[PDB]
């Protein structure tokens, strides 16, 4: 994992080896099903590595981002308490992109999958709504608002 994350950091920095990034991300997500696995994954500072460069991708690629979000959600589901801190950190970083994914569902299959992943991450985080509103008070509130909006959007798109 040390050399791996060093590589991934380099890669996202230069924005290369997309297939490599995605495959490694999938391998990580598969390892993350395990308690000890995700435990070491955090112990690797997977956040400390990925969170910073991941801005570059938005500043396959969206597939890699989605897989990363999936790994984050699964990691929360695996070790909520000790990982909520880093989860909130990354979210505060990836907040704008999560909002964009939740909003794109109006205007596309890729928008759909991105919204689904952002929503799954938000769900995994919801189990700690206390600390969520505690640290990021604007976040949880704007989240509930837009979530009502998007549930309505889904209902309207589906009914007709």
């Amino acid at each position: 994992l040390p050399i791996l994350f060093s590589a991934l950091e380099v890669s996202l920095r230069i924005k290369q080896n997309l297939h490599f990034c995605e495959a490694i991300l999938h391998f990580l997500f598969t390892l993350a099903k395990t308690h000890q696995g995700a435990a070491a994954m955090a112990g690797a500072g997977i956040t400390q590595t990925v969170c910073l460069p991941l801005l570059s991708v938005y500043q396959s690629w969206p597939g890699v981002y989605r897989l990363t979000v999936s790994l984050m959600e699964r990691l929360l589901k695996t070790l909520r308490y000790n990982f909520l801190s880093e989860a909130l950190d990354f979210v505060g970083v990836h907040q704008e992109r999560i909002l964009q994914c939740l909003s794109a569902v109006r205007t596309s299959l890729s928008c759909l999958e991105e919204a689904d992943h952002t929503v799954g991450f938000l769900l995994q985080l919801s189990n700690f709504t206390k600390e969520w509103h505690f640290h990021l008070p604007q976040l949880i509130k704007d989240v509930q608002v837009n979530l009502c909006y998007l549930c309505q959007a889904c209902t309207s798109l589906l009914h007709s």
């Binding site: 400390q48 910073l52 950190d89 505060g92």
Partner: protein
């Protein structure tokens, strides 16, 4: 005013270290809280020390 040793490093003391995370925590908090702050002095100073927010001319605090 371990934050004191950190600042003594920042201003005067060179203070190289072993496997330390430096300027990572500054920029993160800065973008987390400082960037939105109304205090042009505080924001500009954080920008200077943390060497981020490149486009921030902070002109409200610098006019010449």
């Amino acid at each position: 005013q371990d934050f004191k040793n950190c600042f003594q490093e920042y201003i005067h003391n060179k203070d190289r270290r072993l496997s330390p995370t430096t300027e990572n925590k500054l920029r993160l908090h800065y973008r987390r809280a400082v960037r939105a702050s109304t205090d042009p002095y505080k924001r500009a100073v954080y920008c200077i020390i943390g060497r981020c927010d490149v486009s921030d001319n902070h002109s409200e605090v610098a006019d010449k």
